Amino acid sequence: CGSIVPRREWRALASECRERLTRPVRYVVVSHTAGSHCDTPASCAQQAQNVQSYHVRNLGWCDVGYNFLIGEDGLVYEGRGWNIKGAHAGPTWNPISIGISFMGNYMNRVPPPRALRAAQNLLACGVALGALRSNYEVKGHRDVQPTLSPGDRLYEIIQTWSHYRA
Amino acid sequence: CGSIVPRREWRALASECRERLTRPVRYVVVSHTAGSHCDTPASCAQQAQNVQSYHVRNLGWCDVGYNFLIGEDGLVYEGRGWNIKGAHAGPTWNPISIGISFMGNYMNRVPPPRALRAAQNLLACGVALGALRSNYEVKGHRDVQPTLSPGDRLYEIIQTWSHYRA
Ligand SMILES: [Cl-]
What we know:
Two copies of one chain form a homodimer. Chain A is of the alpha/beta class. The first copy, chain A, has helices at about 40-60, 115-130, 150-160; strands at about 25-30, 70, 75-80, 95-100, 130-140. Chain A has one domain (about 1-165). Chain A has a five-stranded mixed β-sheet, covered by helices on one side. The interface between A and B is medium-sized, with 19 and 20 residues. The structure holds chloride ion. Chloride ion (CL) binds next to loops of chain B. The PDB classes it as immune system. The entry lists the keywords cpgrp-S, pgrp-S, immune system. The assembly is dimeric.
């Protein structure tokens, strides 16, 4: 189920991450990268590389912090994926959640409909696979940490999701 | 599901087609447009418009002939959809099959992995909502009509799909 740009196709550095998540997962945390937006497969693969680069090389994480990334190209970029604990929401939320990040800054722009679809589609895929609970809950990054993430314009949107829980 | 770009989002003219498909549908025919290629959402939306516009204004059809279109942006473009008989494989095949078209000429080029993924994902999303049959059969366009569609290279690939039938 789902179309996902695999690690190898956005030319990801090999993962060093080992800590597994306990399936099915109850919580999804939605962030923004607060970085550059991109609207083409070519530019969005490059941006996935840039986010992973910042996390592995500068913050010294085992991989890109996010389980999945969303491009404005309307594609899902594989991060740690469904089975591996992420680094996106702190030490209380990272063990019990999937972290999906919209590549961009959504303080003043909304992500386009294709990106919102790609994200909702991904989560349904999670349920279908048994990676997420049928009764999964969606959180803002700001609901679980002191942050503007995932941006006012995007936060306002995810609040209207059927699985949103403050 | 399956993260399909809706009619309205690619600035489609309204359909005037009435003839429903008898679901669950048994066949999938795979064509190329033999038209211009596109690899950005902006360009691929303009290309679906261009194909629809030819079918409607020039050939006088009720809508774009294809049930679905596949861009090299890795997105699926809603044509006539799951429920409306197409105009893509001729009258033997139009009322019993779903038509999906790769936007481009694939005689001497291959479509990218994300276009092929998008296609496969679309088919599983058909099964899933009951539009296609669990055990559907994929046919080449050149396998049901005197045409080179869907191109030498793309025809070689669909040949190796699990569900492919010669
Ligand atoms: Cl017609």
